[PDB]
Amino acid sequence: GDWSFLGNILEEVNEHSTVIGRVWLTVLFIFRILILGTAAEFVWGDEQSDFVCNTQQPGCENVCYDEAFPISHIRLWVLQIIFVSTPSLVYVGHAVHHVRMEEKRKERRLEGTLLRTYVCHIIFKTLFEVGFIVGHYFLYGFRILPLYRCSRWPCPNVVDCFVSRPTEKTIFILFMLSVASVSLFLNILEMSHLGL
Amino acid sequence: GDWSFLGNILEEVNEHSTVIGRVWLTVLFIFRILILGTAAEFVWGDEQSDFVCNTQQPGCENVCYDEAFPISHIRLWVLQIIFVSTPSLVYVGHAVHHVRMEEKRKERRLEGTLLRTYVCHIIFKTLFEVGFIVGHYFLYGFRILPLYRCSRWPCPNVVDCFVSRPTEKTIFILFMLSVASVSLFLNILEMSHLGL
Numbered sequence: 001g002d003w004s005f006l007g008n009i010l011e012e013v014n015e016h017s018t019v020i021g022r023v024w025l026t027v028l029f030i031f032r033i034l035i036l037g038t039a040a041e042f043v044w045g046d047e048q049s050d051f052v053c054n055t056q057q058p059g060c061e062n063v064c065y066d067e068a069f070p071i072s073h074i075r076l077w078v079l080q081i082i083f084v085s086t087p088s089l090v091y092v093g094h095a096v097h098h099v100r101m102e103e104k105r106k107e108r109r110l111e112g113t114l115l116r117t118y119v120c121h122i123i124f125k126t127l128f129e130v131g132f133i134v135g136h137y138f139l140y141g142f143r144i145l146p147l148y149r150c151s152r153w154p155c156p157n158v159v160d161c162f163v164s165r166p167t168e169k170t171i172f173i174l175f176m177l178s179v180a181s182v183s184l185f186l187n188i189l190e191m192s193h194l195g196l
Numbered sequence: 197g198d199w200s201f202l203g204n205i206l207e208e209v210n211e212h213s214t215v216i217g218r219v220w221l222t223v224l225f226i227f228r229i230l231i232l233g234t235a236a237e238f239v240w241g242d243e244q245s246d247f248v249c250n251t252q253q254p255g256c257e258n259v260c261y262d263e264a265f266p267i268s269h270i271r272l273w274v275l276q277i278i279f280v281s282t283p284s285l286v287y288v289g290h291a292v293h294h295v296r297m298e299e300k301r302k303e304r305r306l307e308g309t310l311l312r313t314y315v316c317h318i319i320f321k322t323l324f325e326v327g328f329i330v331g332h333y334f335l336y337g338f339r340i341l342p343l344y345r346c347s348r349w350p351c352p353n354v355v356d357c358f359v360s361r362p363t364e365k366t367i368f369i370l371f372m373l374s375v376a377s378v379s380l381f382l383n384i385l386e387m388s389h390l391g392l
Contacts, residue, residue, distance in 0.1 A: 054252050054352050149353070156250050157345070158353040 003033055013092035020190045031179045032081055040172050044074045050164035057154055064150035064161045080132040087121035126187045129180055144169045199229055209288035216386045227375045228277055236368050240270045246360035253350055260346035260357045273372055276328040283317035322383045325376055340365045
């Protein structure tokens with residue numbers, strides 16, 4: 001996973017953001033992207049290969065892994081990162097559009113419409129963070145148990161399947177939840193600081 | 197299985213029985229013992245070796261075969277044969293005891309106490325036949341289905357196990373039931389013929 005493109009564009013908008021937005025962005029780079037690439041990706045690497053079911057039924061392990069894990073937590077966190085970063089991109093686009101307009105108009109900072117855009121970007125970041133948190137909760141909760149019982153066809157009756165590294169995965173699930181909540185708190189502080 | 201001993205003793209009591217008792221004994225030799233040794237024993241030969249369960253759990257097939265088949269039908273029919281033959285042995289013992297007494301008393305047929313003994317032997321044969329029929333019914337019924345579902349420990353949840361030769365076994369179960377019922381009818385005819 002090469003995050004160079006997103007990185008370069010978000011460090012562009014480091015220069016154009018509040019101090020609390022610079023903290024938010026540093027958190028995104030260090031506690032989410034870096035963790036994902038240096039730790040979480042390896043934890044989930046053998047998610048299906050080490051998933052085992054007590055059965056001689058061909059196909060059962062496939063369908064039971066798929067039912068237990070409709071989308072891997074790591075893919076969900078990738079999507080979360082991209083969607084929470086998208087409003088920053090929108091804002092920096094608006095800002096650069098104004099810089100190029102000012103240059104052109106001459107040929108021919110957080111005030112006015114850039115403030116409304118910044119506040120909206122904060123709002124959307126907050127809502128997307130909340131949405132991904134809630135979705136994670138309803139999909140998986142915040143704990144992976146070792147045992148998963150499966151009755152999906154072709155599995156005969158109910159079969160016992162065993163998850164890879166449930167405890168390490170639980171630790172990283174809770175870590176990512178905490179990081180997301182810190183991000184939410186930072187966004188709240190941004191709104192308060194702007195208001196006051 | 198060597199039935200020579202029992203055979204010789206029951207062909208001793210061929211000579212001392214009614215015509216209907218000679219028919220009963222011929223039925224015992226031909227339709228029960230001979231069938232058991234020339235046919236049924238081979239049908240049940242691979243009862244556990246070809247019994248298969250859809251599981252990777254060590255021990256499960258053992259406990260599931262044992263729960264499905266607490267006692268093989270062939271062992272049950274062996275016991276049935278011996279118990280229904282036992283009263284004939286008692287009667288012939290009484291008769292030979294009287295023959296040896298008469299010989300001794302000289303040194304020094306179905307009348308009197310031999311009639312009471314013969315009738316009692318018929319009664320006990322009837323009751324044992326009925327008891328084994330009823331026991332067979334309650335234990336297994338009169339049909340072996342291919343699928344047996346098992347939840348005995350160590351089996352995880354419910355496992356699907358598959359029986360060897362369920363249809364051939366059902367055919368022989370019904371055949372042996374019919375032969376037993378014919379034997380019952382013969383005993384009833386014996387009692388009627390003696391009464392009339």
